[PDB]
């Protein structure tokens, strides 16, 4: 038996425009990046760099 749960909420309108968000590793971690211009969805990269 499935019963839809229905919630009524206020309906304000808001300005809505995506802002770039960067992700950063926490202390103890680092992010490796693949720098190949021809990179596949998976597999090895020979040009690899480290970023925070």
């Amino acid at each position: 038996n499935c019963n839809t749960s229905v919630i009524t909420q206020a309906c304000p309108k808001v300005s809505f425009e995506p802002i770039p968000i960067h992700y950063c590793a926490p202390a103890g971690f680092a992010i490796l990046k693949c720098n190949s211009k021809t990179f596949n969805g998976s597999g090895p990269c020979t040009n690899v760099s480290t970023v925070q």
Epitope: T4, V6, T8, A10, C11
Partner: antibody, heavy 127, light 110 residues
Framework: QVQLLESGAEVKKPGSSVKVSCKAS????????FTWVRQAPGQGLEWMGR????????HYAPHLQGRVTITADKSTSTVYLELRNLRSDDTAVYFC?????????????????????WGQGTLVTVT | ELELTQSPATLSVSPGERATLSCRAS??????LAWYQQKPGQAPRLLIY???TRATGVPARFSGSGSGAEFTLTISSLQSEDFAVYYC???????????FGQGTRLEIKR
């Protein structure tokens, strides 16, 4: 284009319950919303609630919800009102109304708060 | 919640008169107000919605306007045909706790 056909009159002993209904005709039931009102017997009107048929969702007036259920069965194009724990205070003419919505089927529902299509009125009293 | 007050309980009119039926809201609304005609034994026909827009089938005699909490329905060249109890309805609510005024009757004096 929307016809509303009300159910007949009824009388119930206080503490009991009544269920009344409206049949929609000439249009697609799921296409648009319906509401219920209570017309007091020689007094003004009370909004009772609203039912959305595209979403099976309903809202009620704040002093009625412990007693009122508004539902619908789209397969018979019928809107239903059920009241429990009745009092003589609830003697009134009850009825449906509808408002055409912008193609709810396509998800272009307006949620209009005013009503255009009105039923005849069904008197419910107590005994 | 919302409450609406009709200023006249009964408006003093005569045929050809300009009816002026005001309605005061307990709180502000912008366009989400409508007017209806309750004739004895009849359905409360919709006249005006959106504060000023007339519904299809409504005579040109019926018009109105308002903002905030102050709205008026007027009837140009009032006919005996228009002697309905007029109700003011306010719906700028979500959840939709919609409300009604007490109703104004028109009466021809004599």
């Amino acid at each position: 284009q929307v016809q509303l056909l009300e159910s007949g009159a009824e009388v119930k002993k206080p503490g009991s319950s009544v269920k009344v209904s409206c049949k929609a005709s000439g249009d697609t039931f799921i296409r648009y919303s319906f509401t219920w009102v209570r017309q007091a017997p020689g007094q003004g009107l009370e909004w009772m609630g609203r039912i959305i048929t595209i979403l099976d969702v309903a809202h009620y007036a704040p002093h009625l919800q412990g007693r009122v259920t508004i539902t619908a069965d789209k397969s018979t194009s019928t809107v239903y009102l059920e009241l429990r724990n009745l009092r003589s205070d609830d003697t009134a003419v009850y009825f449906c109304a509808g408002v055409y919505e912008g193609e709810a089927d396509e998800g272009e529902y307006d949620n209009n708060g005013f009503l255009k299509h009105w039923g005849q009125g069904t008197l419910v009293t107590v005994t | 919640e919302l409450e609406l007050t009709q200023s006249p309980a009964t408006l003093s009119v005569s045929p050809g008169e300009r009816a002026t039926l005001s309605c005061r809201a307990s709180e502000s609304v912008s366009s989400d107000l409508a007017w209806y005609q309750q004739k004895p034994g009849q359905a409360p026909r919709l006249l005006i919605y959106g504060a000023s827009t007339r519904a299809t089938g409504v005579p040109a005699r019926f018009s109105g306007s308002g903002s905030g909490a102050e709205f008026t329905l007027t009837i140009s060249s009032l006919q005996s045909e228009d002697f309905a109890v007029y109700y003011c309805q306010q719906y700028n609510n979500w959840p939709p706790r919609y409300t009604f005024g007490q109703g104004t009757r028109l009466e021809i004096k004599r």
